[PDB]
Specification:
- 7 copies of one chain form a homoheptamer.
- Helix content of chain A is 53%, strand content 23%.
- Chain A is built from 6 helices and 9 strands.
- In chain A, 37% of the residues are buried.
- In chain A, helix 1 runs antiparallel to helix 2 and helix 5 packs antiparallel against helix 6.
- The longest helix of chain A has 34 residues.
- Chain A has a 5-stranded antiparallel beta sheet. A 3-stranded antiparallel beta sheet of chain A has the order 6-8-7, covered by helices on one side.
- Chain A has 254 residues and is an alpha+beta fold.
- The first copy, chain A, is elongated and about 110 Å long.
- Chains in contact: A-B, A-G, B-C, C-D, D-E, E-F, F-G.
- At the F-G interface, helix 2, helix 3, strand 4, helix 6 and strand 9 of F face helix 2, helix 3, helix 4, strand 5 and strand 6 of G.
- Strand 9 of chain B pairs parallel with strand 9 of chain C.
- Chains A, B, C, D, E, F, G: It is found in: Cell inner membrane.
- Chains A, B, C, D, E, F, G: It is a multi-pass membrane protein.
- Chains A, B, C, D, E, F, G: Belongs to the MscS (TC 1.A.23) family.
- Chains A, B, C, D, E, F, G: Keywords: Cell inner membrane, Cell membrane, Ion channel, Ion transport, Membrane, Transmembrane, Transmembrane helix, Transport.
Chain lengths: 254, 254, 254, 254, 254, 254, 254
């Protein structure tokens, strides 16, 4: 009986002291890292309180008092904190997966479900990238993983797809020859890959040809710009007409 | 049997006395710190009631009545309070993450999933911002974290993208020389970065050029405004036509 | 054995009697407060039934019949009631947060995720507001907190944004001087804050100027109405044309 | 040993008999209320089966067969049923909240998240209303509570908003006077409340005025119809033109 | 020791035999009702396996090996199944609610959140209806209960709403008289209910009147068709013009 | 004590041996069925590890070391694998429900939330269909059940709805007679079911009639095609005009 | 008592030593396989900590200190981790399913819920494909499995659908014959499968015919391009008119 009451008190003391020690330890880590008076004090205090309450529970239980009730309420509380925590816990997990496993790493330009920019840093909970115009976006890793991950710095060659519309009474073959001549002449267009030039759509007020040509990443934006300037000039010289919106109107006096 | 009923009564007495002592202690701390009659009295009273209820449960337990049922029901009820609490709990957690971790801090302008304004203050549960027009928005931290966080004050230089459309019969080279002259002259446009001026789209009734030019956050709104006014005037003088909607109409009498 | 069966019977009796007593007590409290035959009778009866079932469970348990099964079933059912209850519980919690914590209070005009009106009363479970057209909306507090809370009565000054489009051949400078003069003269427009008048967009059939001017809440709807009427008259007099939809049509006989 | 095997057999018998008794009781309650052969037979049988399985488990428990496994499985299954049950249970809870608590009561016209009609009856699980055109909707109370609740029979006076567009060359003042005269004369328009008549928008092909006028619910649909017919007649007489879609076309022969 | 090993073996045997018996019973119920070789065999086998595994567990426990581990794992797995199961379980519950409680029963024409047809059968998990064009739709009861439930076979009289647009220079009064005459003459239009004929909208190119008239469900589709044909004819004869799209075009040579 | 340590060691040995045996058995079943080195080796290994860990746990348990901690961790992990599994488990369940219960079966043409084709096979986890254009889609059963299920093959007779628009000055009666005749003459149109031909809408530039005619599934695509070609020819001959877009333009010189 | 305290201390020592040993073992395996300082050190340490905590729990267990509290809290936390982990664990499970099971395999062209390309590799957690234009997408297997999986390299023959619109006064039969001739002549069109050429829609300004023709995957893109060029040339020669947008305008001077 004496050993029991003494053990209970001894535990109460050991509990209070370790709680103060663990709280002080949490504060050492908070300050060394990145301390915030509210976060360090409140978190350290929550740890200290949980430890002491666990201790009082242990003491009454040793005395013979059934703690089942405090255990169940303590368990429900623990589950609630678990649920709220889960969005952030989820993000952390994704971060780990993302880091060991990963596709995109700092410096690569990517597209993470829309929002595409240059990755500045993949962090614990979120990835930060700098969009093309200069905005800084911070994406939550969990969402990053749920979405597709298209990495642009991984690939070497892509394909441009032009679509020029000419007038209906334009010579199908002439158009084809002129476009074919422009891409054939364009160095930056991989000649060993696709090189499509075809009457593709029977337009509303137009008849348009699709042109598909491959080039290496770097080159591609310019290839499209140059091939297009070229298409505009050659067609103008050759007399091929880029039509305005057409409309047949039938007059009725009244 | 006597030891069990006596122990139960002994526990009830110990529970009531400790409940009163712990309540009085909570009041000592409330007054020494910052006491509020409603907060100190209601909090000390809730602590005292929890302690005694626990004691009664423990006593029926000693008398030897299996409390399993009250424990499960008490447990479910706690889980329910925990579930309801979780949305708000969630917001609190996000706030902590947001504060130690944070991307956007007071004074920065941001877009928190639509709603974009200047951050006035990131608080415990919600962040408050002042939209450009002057509205004051209070966004719940949990929602903020689930969404992307796009911060405009973090990067120093961003890019303007003009898209001027001219009349088809316009001189491609002249249009280019003029736009290039305007951006070249504009001091606020960093000359070492991208300075794109190109025939980009073969329009419906237009033929439009895209101009991409970089400048520092501040300067940027003005740079777009000035470069645009300038483009309107230079083009007018140079005789370049900003076309109206074109339409070729074919007449048919009947 | 006899002590076990007698104790079991003794408990069944103590349970039935206390159940009737607790039920009668619930009714005393129901009547003193605000009694409703269905609520007082059904609630008191539910309490009584729970206590008796608990007791029968304890009796079989006292005898030596493992009640684990009834315990788990009772627990799952308890969880289910907790889940159904959680939406409403959630609303109550939000209400508490809303009340001690609150941003918007009676009399303030606000936007609670779309639905924006004047707050009539922040209640226990729901907030009630009266929309500008006269409708009376009752929004569940849980939803209110999940959504953004933009308060218009908090800040005091807001900004109007006009966008007038004139004809392309209008004098840029003249349009700017006339608009500037109008805002300059209008007393209600805070002169120490932003006062933007600029050629902003190179429109379709138009060329439009953006005007951004600040005023105090009240004044603002009127400032816009008045500044606009003013722009309409001043421009007409000065000969600045508000263009109709333009269109170049090219004729073709056939 | 004998007492144990006998007690086990004694329990199995007590279990089968009570199970048959509880099943028959469930059927007495099913028939007295509203019996359905499938529901009464299947529900009573499920109760009987649960009781017997619990008993066999108990018997196993008496001989020395740990039933922990069956207990855990039974519990998880119980949890799942709670989850499935929760949507329906949620509806019931909202119903109770709705009935003792409620804003809208039979006879009142309301808008329950879209679906707006005359309330016919707030029941246990669902509210039934009759839409203006005659349809009969039955809305689940859970959904009703989650959504906003706007009651039109509560307040009593709302506001009409007319928006009349006239020709650009119309006299701003004349238009204002005529509209003002019309609303001024209309008795049904509360004269002590808002009475706005203003040049609101600088239209595309029009120039439009906004008119805001309050009236009591009933009167309001008619006030709008009448004030409008009146606006049409007066404007026609006064020479004010309601413009057709405008369009400036510029001809080009070719 | 012998009693323990024998009891363990005795349990293993009782477990295998009862498992085969319960499986065979599940098959008897499956065949009597609606048997399906895959469902009856797979379900009966799953029950049999669960019973035997529980038995082996009970046996190792009786021999003297703590099964706690197998119990917790078995428990977690059961929880996972409960979660996957919950969508389907949810549908079943709504089904029960739907059948005893239900608004719509076979033969009634309804709209269950869009998808509107005639109910062919309300089943355990889903309702099946036959759309007006003949398609057969199977809607999950859970979704049915979440959505609004509009029943057309419940009320007997509904309201048609016509909206005829005439030309601006039409006589407001004449249009009203003619429409009024048409509805007045049409027998199938309940004369004791609403009978609205009003200038409702000041159209773009039109000036349209709304006409609301009630009739019995059946009569209603035809009433709308007949009243419309009638409006077209009377108007043509009366000289009232149903206008084509208007457009004032202002010419400019260049 | 010796019996306890020996029993513990004997259990460890029995556990390792059975673990290796169960793993080897899983591989026998993997290879006989459809073996994959990674799946068979990893799955067999996971089973083996779970069995041994369970065994070590049981060994310490008999030896008197409270394994509570290892049990809880083991339980959480099981739940996690269970949660991951739940999407697939969910699909499987849906499949079972789908198979005993089902609406659509092989050969039927259906729309399973968008994606609509001919059902090739309702399997365990997924339903496979062949879209009209020839693509082969594999839809997960869970998604299938959550969505509505619209079956086109279930009704034997369906209905076509034609909507032909004629010119405003067309003879209402003549249009009706010609359409009536066309459907009257078309054998494939079930003459005992609905046969609607009516002036349905007072169109923009047209006046359109709706025609509703039933036929048997097969026949229906062709009935619609044939009836339509027929309508075009008869109307052309009869002189009924299928109008182009109308437009009244009012001229204004300036 | 001495045996109990000594056993508790003996266990604590056995626990620390085995924990250090198992940790060192985990490191041996990590390094032999594929070691990563953070993964090997963090994983080994986590194992070590779990073992020790289990030990303290068991020792406190011997020393009579009830650990229930630490066990429930440890349990709630484990549940929470289960939840965060589930998204990623979900992806892994789908990966196993995908690899042993898989429909699409490297080299096959597929559509995995939008994003359609040529699979480059199905890996442990993600599938990587190269979209037609050349982009490299990485899709998370979990998402892939949730979505529909349509495989193009599985089936071999698909269908092209042409929709040619001609002028209203075109000869229905001639249009049909020319189209039929073209498809009849085109070898690449499977002649034993559907070959539909029909007047399908009664256009706005057109009358359009639908043409459905099958071919083998490869051939199909080209079949469509070629059949189309052919339709354009044949129709031009035959005099069939591809109409621009029609419009009847009625003039009104004012």
């Amino acid at each position: 009986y004496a050993v029991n009451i003494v053990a209970a008190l001894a535990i109460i003391i050991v509990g209070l002291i370790i709680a103060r020690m663990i709280s002080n330890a949490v504060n050492r880590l908070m300050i060394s890292r990145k301390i915030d008076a509210t976060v360090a004090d409140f978190l350290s205090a929550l740890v200290r309180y949980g430890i002491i309450a666990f201790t009082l529970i242990a003491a009454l239980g040793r005395v013979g008092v059934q703690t089942a009730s405090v255990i169940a309420v303590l368990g429900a509380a623990g589950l609630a904190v678990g649920l709220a925590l889960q969005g952030s816990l989820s993000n952390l997990a994704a971060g780990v997966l993302l880091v060991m496993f990963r596709p995109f790493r700092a410096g690569e330009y990517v597209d993470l479900g829309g929002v595409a920019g240059t990755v500045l840093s993949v962090q614990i909970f979120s990835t930060t990238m700098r969009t093309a115009d200069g905005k800084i976006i911070v994406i939550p890793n969990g969402k990053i993983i749920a979405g597709n991950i298209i990495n642009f710095s991984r690939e070497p060659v892509r394909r441009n797809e032009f679509i020029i519309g000419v007038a209906y009474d334009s010579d199908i073959d002439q158009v084809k020859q002129i476009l074919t001549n422009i891409i054939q002449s364009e160095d930056r267009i991989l000649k060993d890959r696709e090189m499509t030039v075809r009457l593709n759509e029977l337009g509303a007020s137009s008849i348009n040809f699709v042109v598909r040509v491959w080039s290496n990443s770097g080159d591609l934006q310019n290839v499209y710009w140059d091939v297009l300037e070229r298409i505009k000039r050659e067609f103008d010289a050759a007399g091929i007409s880029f039509p305005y919106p057409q409309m047949d109107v039938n007059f009725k006096r009244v």
